[PDB]
Symmetry: C2
Subunit: 133 residues, 2 copies
């Protein structure tokens, strides 16, 4: 796990990762073209970093995404394979960051940075329970 080290994650886009499936509650997204939603792209980018940093975790710890800063530069219909490359940028204590990039076999589809913080799973949950209605 060294600064500049690369991790790669591949994913064939299925029909149910398009805009309309991100928010089936949204009339505005219902009649939208059948392309990979930016929110699922983000999720897939975060998922590549979660897998890259798994060696760093102590038992009882997990992680939260704390920033995402990316472009989304071409569209992807179902059937193409999206490859995410996550390049470790910094590791300082609980704080990690990556440069992320994604390509669907035809175009580069976007790139930027993602930041994560290591959490104590049980402390964090009690914290969320406290703000639960």
């Amino acid at each position: 796990m060294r600064v500049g080290e690369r991790f790669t994650h591949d994913f064939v886009v299925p029909p149910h990762k398009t805009v309309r499936h991100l928010y089936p509650e949204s009339p505005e997204f219902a009649e939208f073209p059948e392309v990979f939603a930016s929110g699922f792209m983000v999720g897939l980018m975060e998922w590549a970093c979660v897998r890259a940093m798994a060696p760093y975790l102590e038992p009882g710890e997990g992680s939260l995404g704390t920033a995402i800063c990316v472009t989304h530069t071409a569209a992807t219909p179902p059937g193409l394979t999206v490859t995410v490359t996550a390049e470790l940028r910094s590791v300082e204590g609980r704080r990690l960051s990556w440069r992320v990039s994604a390509h669907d076999g035809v175009d580069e589809i976007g790139s930027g940075t993602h930041e994560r913080a290591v959490i104590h799973l049980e402390k964090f949950n009690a914290k969320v329970r406290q703000k639960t209605p």
Copy 2:
């Protein structure tokens, strides 16, 4: 559209918008805290901008998210109302730029910037359909 206008968009987070629901095919996300996913927050910020932009589009037009750059600073359980405030920064031809911010009624949860591009829906669908395998 007028620069500096604020639009707000309220959403009661349901059980199906937590992390594990974003990628049910990810074993990593399966074990995450039951909290609103960053990818779902990105889609919510987009929805708010789409609603704001709607009455200034011509018939046949929609839009795409081209960039997002935001923090995610506090976590949100199902049952809270997430309010996105989106403020128009600029309009230049097909490009609209936005300052966005989100709060769950308890904490500020994130803020930063979003960019969109106006598209002709039929033309874009046709072109995307032609990179489909």
